[PDB]
Design a protein around this ligand. Structure first.
Ligand SMILES: Cn1c(O)c(C(=O)NCC(=O)O)c(=O)c2ccccc21
Ligand SMILES: [Mn+2]
Length: 216
């Protein structure tokens, strides 16, 4: 889908209504697999960190680490298609300009590529931007082919503010997710038992970010 039709007919009304929106088959199998290959190459050539220190034993051979990450600008060698994904995310957002809440998005972060190693680690419940750092929208692209949460876990569970229910999202291949980054969407990644990859970019609201400069 051109994604203008995507943005205008689905993403905009969905965000203003639910604040959590899912788009499947965003880029297609060929492009999605290319991104998957670049991501796995980054992993296989040691570009990710060793993983968030989850459990720190007196003996550090037994230390348990979780999510591994690496920041990608999109111009690095071997990251061209990730850069393409980023440009595609950017186009979609640009066409939503002035229609997502009363925000005015004027920038974004580099992409955070994350890898849950599949050792039973997940990510604790949290809010992406709880203190007004400028980020208004969280964008996540998933890379996991034939992901079966019943076997592999790794579900993203969102706890919509003021609602008594969960919003569970499987980290499926070629799936694109959008959600408000503030306290409206606390969320967690349930234990992942297989390697789980995702690429996240956060979009900035011009006003919030401008005043965050002094709040430092
Ligand atoms: C590795 N990783 C994350 O996976 C998520 C996150 O919420 N992920 C949700 C998901 O992958 O479905 C994060 O929000 C996050 C924030 C700071 C540093 C690392 C982080
Ligand atoms: Mn998060």
């Amino acid at each position: 889908l051109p994604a203008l039709k995507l943005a205008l007919e689905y993403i905009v009304p969905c965000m203003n209504k639910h604040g959590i929106c899912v788009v499947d088959d965003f880029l297609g199998k060929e492009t999605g697999q290319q991104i998957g290959d670049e991501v796995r190459a980054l992993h296989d050539t040691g570009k990710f960190t060793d993983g968030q220190l989850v459990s720190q034993k007196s003996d550090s051979s037994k230390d348990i680490r979780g999510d591994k990450i690496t920041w990608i600008e999109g111009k690095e060698p071997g990251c061209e298609t990730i850069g393409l994904l980023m440009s595609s995310m950017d186009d979609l957002i640009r066409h939503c300009n002035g229609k997502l809440g009363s925000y005015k998005i004027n920038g974004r972060t580099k992409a955070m590529v994350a890898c849950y190693p599949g050792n039973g680690t997940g990510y604790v419940r949290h809010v992406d931007n709880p203190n007004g750092d400028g980020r208004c929208v969280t964008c996540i692209y998933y890379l996991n082919k034939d992901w079966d949460a019943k076997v592999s876990g790794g579900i993203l569970r969102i706890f919509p503010e003021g609602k008594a229910q969960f919003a569970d999202i499987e980290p499926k291949f070629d799936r694109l997710l959008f959600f408000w980054s503030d306290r409206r969407n606390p969320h967690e990644v349930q234990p992942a038992y297989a390697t789980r990859y995702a690429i996240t970019v956060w979009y900035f609201d011009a006003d919030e970010r401008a005043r965050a400069k002094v709040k430092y």
